[PDB]
Structure formats: C-alpha cells, structure tokens
Design a protein around this ligand. Structure first.
Ligand SMILES: N[C@H](CCC(=O)N[C@@H](CS)C(=O)NCC(=O)O)C(=O)O
Ligand SMILES: N[C@H](CCC(=O)N[C@@H](CS)C(=O)NCC(=O)O)C(=O)O
Ligand SMILES: N[C@H](CCC(=O)N[C@@H](CS)C(=O)NCC(=O)O)C(=O)O
Ligand SMILES: N[C@H](CCC(=O)N[C@@H](CS)C(=O)NCC(=O)O)C(=O)O
Ligand code: FES
Ligand code: FES
Ligand code: NA
Ligand code: NA
Lengths: 113, 112, 113, 112
C-alpha cells in the first residue's frame, strides 16, 4: 500500500467506465490516447477520465498496480480492459459497444426526464 | 502567423527543441530522451512545449516536413527526432554540432 | 548521396508496392509492422517487403530519406503512404484497397493462365 | 515446457533481461534503453533475445503477467519494463539492487 494506490483503487471502484489517458478527451496529448478516447466515446455512454500528465503520482504508480506499462488504460467495472490497440480492435468488432452498453445498464439508477 | 511565429522561433534560437512537456517534466519518453542527450552537450538551449502550444503541434509537422515530436532544430535547420539525436550523441556528432553552434553564435569581433 | 540511399531509391522505384517493416510478413517483430502487413496483405495483391532488422544500413538511413522517423513504411508507386496508423485507417475506410488495386492494375503485364 | 524453460531461466540467472535483439544490436529502442541502464550498473547479466525465441515471446507475457518487452528479472522476480528500469537507474535504486544481487550471489563461506 501507498496513498496513491489507495487513490487509484477508489477511482477504479467508484467509476465503472474509466480511461486513464494523456491529456483530456477534448484535448488528447498523444495519438494512442486520442484513438482510445474516440472509440470509447463513440459507444455513447458516460465515462470518466484521468489525465495522467496532470497526476504524476498516478503516472508513476499505476503501471505496476495495473500490470500494464502504458497509457491509455481503459478500466471497466474494476477490470483492466487494455490500452489503445485492444480498445480499437474491440470497437472494430462491436465488442466494446456491448461491454460498455451492459456496464452502463448495470449501474444505471436515476434517469433524465 | 502560426507559421510566422514558428519561423521566428527557428530564426532566433540557434539550438531549439520542440518537445512534449518541459526539460524538467517531459510528457513523453521520446521527448525525455532527446532533452537528456541535448542537455548532456553542455550548452544552453531553448525549448517549446508543443502540448502548451496546440497551434504549433498542428502546423509544425507540415512546415518541417517531419511528422513527429521531439524535433531538434540547430542553426535554422531540422536535425531530426529522438532516434537521430540519441544516435548522434552516441557517435559524438551531436556534441560537436552543439559546441560548434554555441561558439559560433557567441563569437565577437575584437574590442577597439 | 550514399550507396545506401541509392539502394533504397532502386527498391522504391522497382517495387510499386513496398513495405519496410520489422521482421517479415510471416513473422513480424513488432505489432506496428504486424498490423500494417495484415491490412496490406488483405488487399490481395503482390507486395514486396524489406525487413529493416536485417538491413542496418536501411534502418539507419531510410528515416531521413523518407522524412519519416519510424517503421513500418508503406511506399506505393514511389510515394510514402505512411506507417501503421495511416495504413490501417485507410483499410478501415476502404481507401487502401482502392489504391493498391489500381496500383497493381497500372503495373500488370503478364497474367497467370 | 516453454514455461518450464522460462522457469529455469528465471531460476538460474539472478539478473536476466528478456529483450528484442541483443545488447550490442537491439531491435527496439525500449530494449536498447533498458540494456544500456542495466549495463551501466557494472555487473554481468544474462539476456534472452525474444525475437529468436518465438515461443518465449508468446508465452512469457501471460506467465509474467506483464504484457511487453523488455522485462528485467532479478533474483526470480519481475522488476519491470523499460520505463521502470530507467527511472530506477535515475534514482540510483537499480544500481543498489544490481550490486546487492551480484554480491549476494558471489558470496562464499570461509575456506577451511
Ligand atoms: N500500443 C499502445 C501503446 C501505448 C503506449 O506506448 N504508451 C506510452 C507512450 S504514450 C506510455 O504510456 N508510456 C509511459 C508514460 O509515458 O508514462 C497501446 O495499445 O496502448
Ligand atoms: N521515433 C521517435 C519518436 C517520436 C514520436 O514517435 N512522436 C510521436 C508520439 S509523441 C508524435 O509526435 N506524434 C505526433 C503528435 O503526437 O503530435 C523519434 O525518432 O522522434
Ligand atoms: N504510430 C506508429 C508507430 C511506428 C513506430 O513507433 N515505430 C518505431 C518502433 S518499431 C520505430 O520504427 N523506431 C525506429 C527504429 O526502431 O528503428 C505508426 O503509425 O507507424
Ligand atoms: N513502455 C515500455 C515499452 C516496452 C513495449 O511497449 N514493448 C512493446 C513493443 S516492443 C511490446 O513488447 N509488445 C509486445 C511484443 O511485441 O511482443 C516499457 O516500459 O517497457
Ligand atoms: S506522448 Fe509520445 S508516444 Fe504517447
Ligand atoms: S519493436 Fe518495440 S515498438 Fe516496435
Ligand atoms: Na492526440
Ligand atoms: Na508482431
């Protein structure tokens, strides 16, 4: 344990669809992060992001915690899906759309109206 | 205009590194490696963090005819990216170019 | 000029569809090269490759000649198309298929039969 | 079997680097950087070129629970990849671990 592992654990436990990336969804800082965020966002459900370029503690500690050396990282329902290559392949096959749709449905409570 | 800004930058800084993040705080390992080799050459240099200058990030690639960052520019010419810079350092070429550039730019006429 | 630039120029002038990559099409040595070769090959036309991991002179000199720091590189009819990201996007849009089909047609002479 | 081979490797080599290419001739800059930091620590080490061992390339990721190369293994444990190794070197931690490992492995009982 470190306080930063504790922080990451909260983020992952509290956000069922979570993308750690370089930059933000509106202004990505790396093509790998841009590609991943485009495919994720196209699934049409709410997602949370962390810009690891503004969070040096997470940038340093997450790779070892995740057993995954790189960014971006998509975590869905507490599990690491993978990085850019994985996320875009899944989108290409239609599988990302299904995972994300079912995840948002599992955690849906209040509805706009 | 963004191109004019870029043109001046290249014109006014004899050793100039476009990179992601800053030398103390790189945002990409390619930019980290390039700045570390350059810094090792012992001469002052200028950098532009292209993540804080979205216009430059967007326009420099086509201006430079070089698609990526970092980019090292010396005496108004593109030297290359991370892989070029680190090989030059290994071969001792970068040290030479950087020494030569800094000394040529500091050189003055005798006083009188 | 160097003798290696001369060699690269011949390769590009003599091979209308040419992929410089890490490893070979049957045994790629890097996911970027694997992805590019898969998309290219799926276009269904003859292509030539150079494994730059067996050609240190080309690995050293091509990036500066190409104005393109990385591998893989797809060259079509003497022009650099780009690397992995470009080639797969083009395949995704159907544009790679058309470029490659028209290129093979332009250079076709003898036919099997 | 490929896993048994891997298990022995890790068991029999206290400082072990799985990489692309060899230390004199890396096939990837990530592998080049890791070997250069490791070599700088002053101790002998072993490497496996995973581009000449397709079975290891394929199987080690799931065995290691670490998807990529290079991978540095020390005293039977995974230290990490390129980014971990180069940061450890910068902080002086890698030097310590590598010195400690080599000395512990060379240590002998008094003669008698
Ligand atoms: N193959 C990609 C590559 C991702 C990647 O290479 N990320 C690098 C460059 S942005 C990285 O996160 N390095 C660690 C760091 O900069 O902290 C993927 O599937 O996600
Ligand atoms: N092969 C390296 C790597 C540099 C690189 O691949 N940069 C990429 C990723 S940081 C890039 O700038 N892409 C354009 C962009 O992100 O704006 C070199 O020699 O410079
Ligand atoms: N974004 C990719 C990246 C290609 C890439 O990063 N290639 C690197 C790693 S294989 C490279 O060729 N480095 C120069 C070298 O190893 O000689 C593309 O579109 O092609
Ligand atoms: N972020 C680096 C880079 C290492 C890396 O991204 N390796 C990739 C490209 S060489 C890889 O081994 N992919 C699996 C494979 O090619 O077998 C690290 O910390 O180790
Ligand atoms: S910021 Fe340079 S490769 Fe991602
Ligand atoms: S061989 Fe390592 S990124 Fe291509
Ligand atoms: Na981007
Ligand atoms: Na591959």
């Amino acid at each position: 344990m470190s306080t930063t592992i504790e922080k990451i654990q909260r983020q992952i436990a509290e956000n069922p669809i979570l993308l750690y990336m370089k930059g933000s969804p509106k202004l990505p800082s790396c093509g790998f992060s841009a590609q991943a965020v485009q495919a994720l966002a196209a699934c049409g459900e709410r997602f949370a992001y962390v810009d690891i370029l503004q969070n040096p503690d997470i940038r340093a500690e997450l790779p070892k915690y995740a057993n995954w050396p790189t960014f971006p990282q998509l975590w869905v329902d507490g599990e690491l899906v993978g990085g850019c290559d994985i996320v875009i392949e899944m989108y290409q096959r239609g599988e990302l759309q299904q995972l994300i749709k079912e995840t948002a449905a599992k955690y849906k409570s209040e509805e706009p109206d």
